[PDB]
Enzyme design. Structure first.
Site, PDB file in Angstrom:
ATOM      1  N   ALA A  96      84.933 104.648  19.139  1.00 22.54           N
ATOM      2  CA  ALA A  96      85.110 103.207  19.014  1.00 22.54           C
ATOM      3  C   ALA A  96      84.320 102.662  17.831  1.00 22.54           C
ATOM      4  O   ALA A  96      84.855 101.915  17.002  1.00 22.54           O
ATOM      5  CB  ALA A  96      84.698 102.510  20.310  1.00 22.54           C
ATOM      6  N   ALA A 148      80.823 114.377  24.086  1.00 22.82           N
ATOM      7  CA  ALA A 148      80.056 114.191  25.308  1.00 22.82           C
ATOM      8  C   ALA A 148      80.928 114.068  26.550  1.00 22.82           C
ATOM      9  O   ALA A 148      80.389 113.904  27.649  1.00 22.82           O
ATOM     10  CB  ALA A 148      79.161 112.954  25.179  1.00 22.82           C
ATOM     11  N   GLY A 197      80.874 108.743  26.131  1.00 20.88           N
ATOM     12  CA  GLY A 197      79.643 109.484  26.326  1.00 20.88           C
ATOM     13  C   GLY A 197      78.749 109.462  25.105  1.00 20.88           C
ATOM     14  O   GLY A 197      77.521 109.445  25.229  1.00 20.88           O
ATOM     15  N   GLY A 213      79.205 106.965  22.470  1.00 23.84           N
ATOM     16  CA  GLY A 213      78.934 105.551  22.279  1.00 23.84           C
ATOM     17  C   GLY A 213      77.824 105.044  23.175  1.00 23.84           C
ATOM     18  O   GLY A 213      76.959 104.279  22.741  1.00 23.84           O
ATOM     19  N   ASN A 219      87.440  94.741  25.607  1.00 21.65           N
ATOM     20  CA  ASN A 219      88.772  95.183  25.206  1.00 21.65           C
ATOM     21  C   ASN A 219      89.864  94.424  25.948  1.00 21.65           C
ATOM     22  O   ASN A 219      90.954  94.219  25.403  1.00 21.65           O
ATOM     23  CB  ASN A 219      88.924  96.689  25.439  1.00 21.65           C
ATOM     24  CG  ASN A 219      88.569  97.508  24.212  1.00 21.65           C
ATOM     25  OD1 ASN A 219      88.482  96.982  23.102  1.00 21.65           O
ATOM     26  ND2 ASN A 219      88.377  98.809  24.405  1.00 21.65           N
ATOM     27  N   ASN A 234      91.429  96.830  16.523  1.00 23.11           N
ATOM     28  CA  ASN A 234      90.296  96.959  15.617  1.00 23.11           C
ATOM     29  C   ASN A 234      90.393  96.018  14.424  1.00 23.11           C
ATOM     30  O   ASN A 234      89.363  95.537  13.938  1.00 23.11           O
ATOM     31  CB  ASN A 234      90.165  98.410  15.157  1.00 23.11           C
ATOM     32  CG  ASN A 234      89.646  99.310  16.259  1.00 23.11           C
ATOM     33  OD1 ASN A 234      89.110  98.829  17.260  1.00 23.11           O
ATOM     34  ND2 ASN A 234      89.793 100.619  16.083  1.00 23.11           N
ATOM     35  N   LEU A 244      68.920  89.212   9.370  1.00 24.32           N
ATOM     36  CA  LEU A 244      69.117  89.637  10.754  1.00 24.32           C
ATOM     37  C   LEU A 244      68.195  88.888  11.709  1.00 24.32           C
ATOM     38  O   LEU A 244      68.580  88.584  12.843  1.00 24.32           O
ATOM     39  CB  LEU A 244      68.893  91.143  10.878  1.00 24.32           C
ATOM     40  CG  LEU A 244      69.859  92.051  10.122  1.00 24.32           C
ATOM     41  CD1 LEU A 244      69.441  93.504  10.276  1.00 24.32           C
ATOM     42  CD2 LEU A 244      71.279  91.843  10.619  1.00 24.32           C
ATOM     43  N   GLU A 283      67.358  85.888  11.690  1.00 29.00           N
ATOM     44  CA  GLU A 283      67.855  84.553  11.998  1.00 29.00           C
ATOM     45  C   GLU A 283      68.830  84.553  13.170  1.00 29.00           C
ATOM     46  O   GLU A 283      68.986  83.519  13.828  1.00 29.00           O
ATOM     47  CB  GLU A 283      68.504  83.946  10.752  1.00 29.00           C
ATOM     48  CG  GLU A 283      68.641  82.436  10.794  1.00 29.00           C
ATOM     49  CD  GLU A 283      68.899  81.837   9.424  1.00 29.00           C
ATOM     50  OE1 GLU A 283      68.824  82.587   8.425  1.00 29.00           O
ATOM     51  OE2 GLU A 283      69.172  80.618   9.348  1.00 29.00           O
TER      52      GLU A 283
END
Ligand SMILES: Nc1nc2c(ncn2[C@@H]2O[C@H](COP(=O)(O)OP(=O)(O)OP(=O)(O)O)[C@@H](O)[C@H]2O)c(=O)[nH]1
Ligand SMILES: Nc1ncnc2c1ncn2[C@@H]1O[C@H](COP(=O)(O)OP(=O)(O)CP(=O)(O)O)[C@@H](O)[C@H]1O
Ligand SMILES: Nc1nc2c(ncn2[C@@H]2O[C@H](COP(=O)(O)OP(=O)(O)O)[C@@H](O)[C@H]2O)c(=O)[nH]1
Ligand SMILES: CN[C@@H](C)c1ccc(F)cc1
Ligand SMILES: [Ca+2]
Ligand SMILES: [Ca+2]
Ligand SMILES: [Ca+2]
Ligand SMILES: [Mg+2]
Ligand SMILES: [Mg+2]
Ligand SMILES: [Mg+2]
Lengths: 54, 352, 438, 423
Positions: free
Chosen positions: C12, C99, C144, C146, C206, C228, C252, C254
């Protein structure tokens, strides 16, 4: 209904509108967890082989 | 074949709706924890709304509107009316009410006393009533001292509102009463008023010089059948239906139930439900809701109607369970899940 | 200028990352060979786009990205795809067997053998940065890798980059596009071990992306490519402030400052509009008020929930296209008089507004229509706790029977980690209720 | 490159295994000489899962043929695709196993198992990343049953972390060779409970009934039964042999089908089973695929509950209409799916249909109704064992009655384990 901090540039602008005011584990510890799990896998596989040897 | 689950075994209304659904031979009942349902007859408290509408391929419907408690809670109703511009603080069909938290816990104590002191000074009738949703626990008194002290002895929020000292009294008997109206709102937010109402009458003569005995002041069916000695004397079960009540209004007051009372009830029902529609509508939601409401009204000797409270899980009159429960299936369930008149409701049109 | 390193973990994350960098290039005028004609500083420069792209002496613009997957078939798509030339081999890391949808296998068994390699490749990117801000970590909950390997990566990142921020883009599991029954297990295991290591996480359900594609794009059976491309539009809206000149969400840090007053409650709800089908004859262009109002419709939220029955803690409006502040304030005024927008009392009732004049870029031949203006609302609602409840409930159903638990124990995970992770989510659900309910 | 090593043992195992390679070789465009003559890149995308590539662009099945007598494997080598197998992969003896589990497992089989593992090792050493193994065999004979389960045990010892998968034909008195089949099947089932990750239970009685009642075959033969197994084996392995997402890997399939380690015995089903030119609608595929008459374990699913279900649809069809029909079967019979495993029904689509079919659907169910199959076996086992009937064939090979008593207990435990989750 107040606007504050209006910033403008060539590619856009940003501001803020207010409608109402208000009223870790160390590297060592990570290795232990990883190695502990590996040890449990090893112990389980050893018991499988011991069972197969019998 | 549609599927439904039951999660409130104590609901007489939906116990019948469930009994009807099965009779159609086109609805199947699943265990209360099975998520693959089309219809949920949910629990009264903590209904898991967040789990509805996430089953692929199942249009799911529930018999409660998330957020409707704002209307069906004593304290909430008062707060909703005073703070909503659609209803405003000057709303003319709701008694003057105040939210009072017990001192052992915003709160409208000082605001209540101010209006109270004004009435006491102006020689006006200054009788108030204190109640709460945590009751079977009611007190009627003309002294502000007694009303406030009674709430401190408790530990839950209460509401003090003006007591209607000039109620309309049926004759013979000189007796108080209240009007129960059942209102069904479907998934499209149509407001249907059941053509059949009930007057829950007091079998005791109204007495304004003694609020200590609460049997002639409280028209609750449980209180009349437990503490009233004339229960069932004038009408069966202290319940007068619209036909008899309309005939009375004609013989006594030379008017009709529709003209003198019903227009105000329909107006009140519309106002309350239209007010919270933006907050509880399921028009663009992943699931759909409908709900049956029990509106309670008081009528004064001027034929003015007052809203008392709204019940979110109302019961029905024994004689009217069949008709109404069928109507629930017709307009609320089968409209979303059709099966393979002269409606019993009165559609209160409005602007969405 | 300060650099941002993107990390894509699992199928993903990698495929979403592939869609984003595709969009990033079209937005910044970068060709698949890495050349960017508009960049008049060859081989260097500290422009806004340099936060996401480094430069070689030959004028190539290389994403500051790492792709990691325990199996090579998905990353092989990048190596031979249109943008194969953007990245160099060190950036693409793949193992030989995955995984198997098993958190314990991605986190412990396989993760332990590849973690140091991934950190080494990330260290190479970090060494090209003069002032690294932090990381953007894309991954799924259900996989697994992700789930399992991401959590291990987040822990090590906090050790190797203590002062750096880490944002997540996480794919919440949806049965309509999932074939793994144990994804509730993995989602909760990875939320538990990642919670204290992520500063701000944008969850994308999703189920929401799927319904938006069927409803607004008229795709009867959406594919991962459909899902996507829509997801990278939202990601683009969220990261545009780091890649373009501006004053809102310019680093980042902020994001946490503006959207996360309480550290554990760092899951903003994302809402996007408008999503218009390109196959339409031609669409009436929506106004600032209409697309803003759409931000309070459940149908365009990245997670299906009802914000009307939560409380807001923060709210950012990110506009792209023909938008002037005048129209924004007008729309907001109208939406307050009609919408149920309750803030927590300890927070101001307001909106931070950002506008980028460049309207959304759409991939040629994609499913999305070119619109003159769009907006992405980032709001921190207690209503998003509904998603935790749904997930925690599915966890409880299976775990009551210890269903599938033997797969995790067999990889060296203790059963107690299940209940430990579940109790942490129970605490997370309680925190949301204390903040949003009276 | 996720290679699977295939093994077929005994008469049944080799005859069904043979047809399997005949069926899938056709789907992948491999001719009897191993030369590819397909016309779709989808055919070769995952061809290496079951095939090795030799010089001259030749595709050689990764199959090991095992038997204790030469007869059946000479038929294979003389069969249609006999020449496509690696000659060195034929491992056989001459003694036979006399339909005797003890001979295959302890005496005759033990003498031959090492040379089989030498070939297994040879195939595994050439795998980029070995997924695991799949074994085709029957449980009612001696070689496939006794030596087959001996092979799994010794394979697991050498590859403890790979996936072991079997297609196991269960005996039935209606299609029976010898009266000792319940003995051999009960001894094997215990092995399988311990040492396999996934077992597809194929009941010869179900195969018979389907041939007699549905297919209207007056006199079914083993050939007719094997046509159903071939079609089923091709269906259940479609996820492995073509690009996909659902259960596209042996370990991922196990992770989603096996909630408890010992309950890994699946009921497979196929559709259609046939007016033979008529088009078959997606609803018809779904109704049939879930119909008991289309399943191959001879167990009524309405007598138990599905723990997990895996469906595969092959051919050009409406994936939207597929999701609708699958969601219709679950929502119209959710009383047969355990509610404590959310979304336990997973559906996968493949565009290439089997030879001579516009579309088809293969069904894989982990149902607790399978306990009916082990109850039948257990009953037949006990009817003879209580009188020690025919035991001498086994005690003459070194076995003791205690070993039978333990196999009995183990299978009755298995049945009880299915019963508790059915409630
Ligand atoms: N939106 C979106 N979701 C995806 C995509 N790929 C996988 N998913 C979701 O991710 C979940 C499965 O996790 P994966 O990312 O495929 O697994 P993984 O991270 O590769 O880990 P492994 O178990 O080793 O394969 C499912 O819920 C899928 O719906 C994608 O490209 N886009
Ligand atoms: N302001 C007021 N003036 C006069 N009478 C009042 C009153 N408030 C309540 N009552 C009396 O109290 C009775 C019921 O009170 P209330 O409805 O608040 O309690 P409750 O909710 O337990 C009964 P229900 O839910 O069935 O309507 C009514 O019959 C009415 O006669
Ligand atoms: N479906 C099918 N079953 C078979 C076949 N041959 C034998 N059987 C069954 O398998 C069992 C006999 O096992 P078999 O394979 O002949 O013994 P083995 O050679 O020693 O392994 C009996 O239950 C038979 O009904 C076959 O070709 N197809
Ligand atoms: C067991 N006897 C042989 C002849 C046989 C084979 C298959 C079948 F379906 C029926 C019988
Ligand atoms: Ca430059
Ligand atoms: Ca940190
Ligand atoms: Ca010998
Ligand atoms: Mg009440
Ligand atoms: Mg993967
Ligand atoms: Mg034989």
């Amino acid at each position: 209904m107040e606007v504050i901090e209006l910033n403008k540039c060539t590619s856009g602008q940003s501001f803020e509108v207010i409608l109402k005011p208000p009223s870790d584990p160390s590297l060592e510890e990570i290795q232990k967890k990883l190695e502990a799990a590996e040890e449990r896998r090893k112990y389980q596989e050893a018991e499988l082989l011991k069972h197969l040897a019998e | 074949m549609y599927t439904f689950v039951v999660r409130d075994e104590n609901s007489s209304v939906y116990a019948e709706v469930s009994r009807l659904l099965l009779a159609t031979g086109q609805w199947k009942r699943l265990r209360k924890d099975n998520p693959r349902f089309n219809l949920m007859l949910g629990e009264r408290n903590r209904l898991p709304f967040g789990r509805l509408g996430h089953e692929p391929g199942l249009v799911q419907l529930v018999n409660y509107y998330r957020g409707a408690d704002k209307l069906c809670r004593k304290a909430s109703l008062v707060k909703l009316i005073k703070t909503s511009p659609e209803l405003s603080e000057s709303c003319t069909w709701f008694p003057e009410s105040y939210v009072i938290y017990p001192t052992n816990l915003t709160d409208e104590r000082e605001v209540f006393l101010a209006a109270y002191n004004r009435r006491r000074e102006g020689r006006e009738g200054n009788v108030w009533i204190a109640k709460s949703s945590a009751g079977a626990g009611i007190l009627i008194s003309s002294e502000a001292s007694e009303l406030l002290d009674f709430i401190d002895e408790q530990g839950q929020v209460h509401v003090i509102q003006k007591y209607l000292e000039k109620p309309l009294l049926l004759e013979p008997g000189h007796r108080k009463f209240d009007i129960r109206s059942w209102v069904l709102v479907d998934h499209l937010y149509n407001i249907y008023l059941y053509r059949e109402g009930v007057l829950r009458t007091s079998s005791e003569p109204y007495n304004s010089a003694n609020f200590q005995d609460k049997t002639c002041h409280l028209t609750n069916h449980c209180i009349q059948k437990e503490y009233s000695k004339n229960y069932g004397r004038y009408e069966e079960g202290n319940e007068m239906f619209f036909e008899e009540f309309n005939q009375y209004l004609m013989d006594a007051l030379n008017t009709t139930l529709e003209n003198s009372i019903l227009l105000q009830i329909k107006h009140i029902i519309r106002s309350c439900l239209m007010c919270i529609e933006p907050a509880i509508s399921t028009k663009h939601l992943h699931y759909q809701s409908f709900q049956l409401f029990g509106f309670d009204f008081m009528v004064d000797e001027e034929l003015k109607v007052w809203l008392i409270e709204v019940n979110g899980a109302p019961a029905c009159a024994q004689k009217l369970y069949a008709e109404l429960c069928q109507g629930i299936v017709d307009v609320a369930i089968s409209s979303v899940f059709p099966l393979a008149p002269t409606s019993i409701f009165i559609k209160l049109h409005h602007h969405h | 200028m300060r650099e941002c390193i993107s990390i894509h973990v699992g199928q993903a994350g990698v495929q979403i990352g592939n869609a984003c960098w595709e969009l990033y290039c079209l937005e910044h005028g970068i060709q698949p060979d890495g050349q960017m004609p508009s960049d008049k500083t060859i081989g260097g420069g500290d422009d806004s786009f340099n936060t996401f792209f480094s430069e070689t002496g030959a004028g190539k613009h290389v994403p500051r990205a790492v792709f990691v997957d325990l199996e090579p078939t998905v990353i092989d798509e990048v190596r031979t795809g249109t943008y194969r030339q953007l990245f160099h081999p060190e950036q693409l890391i793949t193992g030989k067997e995955d995984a198997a949808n098993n958190y314990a296998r991605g986190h412990y068994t396989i993760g332990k053998e590849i973690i140091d390699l991934v950190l080494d490749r990330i260290r190479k990117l970090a060494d090209q940065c003069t002032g690294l801000q932090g990381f953007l970590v894309f991954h799924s909950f259900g996989g697994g890798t992700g789930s399992g390997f991401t959590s291990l990566l987040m822990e090590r990142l906090s050790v190797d980059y203590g002062k750096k921020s880490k944002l997540e883009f996480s794919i919440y599991p949806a049965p309509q596009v999932s074939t793994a029954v144990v994804e509730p297990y993995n989602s909760i295991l990875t939320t538990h071990t990642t919670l204290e290591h992520s500063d701000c996480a944008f969850m994308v359900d999703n189920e929401a992306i799927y319904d938006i594609c069927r409803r607004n794009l008229d795709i009867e059976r959406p594919t991962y490519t459909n899902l996507n491309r829509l997801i990278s539009q939202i990601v683009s809206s969220i990261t545009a402030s780091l890649r373009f000149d501006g004053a809102l969400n310019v680093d980042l840090t902020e994001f946490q400052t503006n959207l996360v007053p309480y550290p554990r409650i760092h899951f903003p709800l994302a809402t996007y509009a408008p999503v218009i089908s390109a196959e339409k004859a031609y669409h009436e262009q929506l106004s600032v008020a209409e697309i803003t109002n759409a931000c309070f419709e459940p149908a365009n939220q990245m997670v299906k929930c009802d914000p009307r029955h939560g409380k807001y803690m923060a709210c950012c409006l990110l506009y792209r296209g023909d938008v002037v502040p005048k129209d924004v304030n007008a729309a907001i005024a109208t939406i307050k008089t009609k919408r149920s927008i309750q803030f927590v009392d300890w927070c101001p009732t307001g909106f931070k507004v950002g506008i980028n004049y460049q309207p959304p870029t759409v991939v040629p031949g994609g499913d999305l229509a070119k619109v003159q203006r769009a907006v992405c609302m980032l709001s921190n609602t207690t209503a998003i706790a509904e998603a935790w409840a749904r997930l925690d409930h599915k966890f409880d159903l299976m775990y009551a029977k210890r269903a599938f638990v033997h797969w995790y124990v067999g990889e060296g995970m203790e059963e107690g980690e299940f209940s430990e992770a579940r109790e942490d989510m129970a605490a997370l659900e309680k925190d949301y209720e204390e903040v949003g309910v009276d | 490159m996720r290679e699977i090593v295939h093994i077929q043992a005994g008469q049944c195992g080799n005859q069904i295994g043979a047809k399997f390679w005949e069926v899938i070789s056709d789907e992948h465009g491999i001719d009897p000489t191993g030369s590819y003559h397909g016309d779709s890149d989808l055919q070769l995308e995952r061809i290496n899962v079951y095939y090795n590539e030799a010089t001259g662009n030749k595709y050689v099945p990764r199959a090991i043929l095992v038997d204790l007598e030469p007869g059946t494997m000479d038929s294979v080598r003389s069969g249609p695709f006999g020449q496509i197998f690696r000659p060195d992969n034929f491992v056989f003896g001459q003694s036979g196993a006399g339909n005797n589990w003890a001979k295959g497992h302890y005496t005759e089989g033990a003498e031959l198992v090492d040379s089989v593992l030498d070939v297994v090792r040879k195939e595994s050493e050439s795998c980029d990343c070995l997924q695991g193994f799949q074994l085709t065999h029957s449980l009612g004979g001696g070689t496939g049953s006794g030596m087959g389960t001996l092979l799994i045990s010794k394979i697991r010892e050498e590859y403890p972390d790979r996936i072991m998968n079997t297609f196991s034909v269960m005996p039935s008195p209606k299609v029976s060779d010898t009266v000792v089949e319940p003995y051999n099947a009960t001894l094997s089932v215990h092995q399988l409970v311990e040492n396999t990750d996934e077992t597809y239970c194929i009941d010869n009685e179900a195969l018979y009934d389907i041939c007699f009642r549905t297919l209207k075959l007056t006199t079914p033969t083993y050939g007719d039964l094997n046509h159903l197994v071939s079609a089923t084996m091709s269906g259940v392995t479609t996820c492995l042999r073509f690009p996909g997402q659902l259960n596209a890997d042996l370990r991922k399939l196990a992770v989603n089908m096996v909630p408890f380690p010992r309950l890994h015995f699946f009921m497979p089903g196929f559709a259609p089973l046939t007016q033979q030119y008529r088009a078959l609608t997606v609803p018809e595929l779904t109704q049939q695929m879930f119909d008991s008459k289309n399943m191959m374990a001879a167990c009524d699913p309405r007598h138990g509950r599905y723990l997990t279900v895996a469906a595969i649809f092959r051919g050009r069809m409406s994936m939207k209409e597929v999701d609708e029909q699958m969601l219709n079967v679950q929502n119209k019979n959710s009383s047969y799916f355990v509610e404590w495993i959310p979304n336990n029904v997973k559906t996968a689509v493949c565009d290439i249909p089997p030879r001579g079919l516009k579309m088809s659907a293969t069904f894989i169910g982990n149902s607790t109704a399978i306990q009916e199959l082990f109850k039948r076996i257990s009953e037949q086992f006990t009817a003879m064992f209580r009188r020690k009937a025919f035991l001498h064939w086994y005690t003459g090979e070194g076995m003791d009655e205690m070993e039978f008593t333990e196999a009995e207990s183990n299978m009755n435990d298995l049945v009880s384990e299915y019963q508790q989750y059915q409630d």
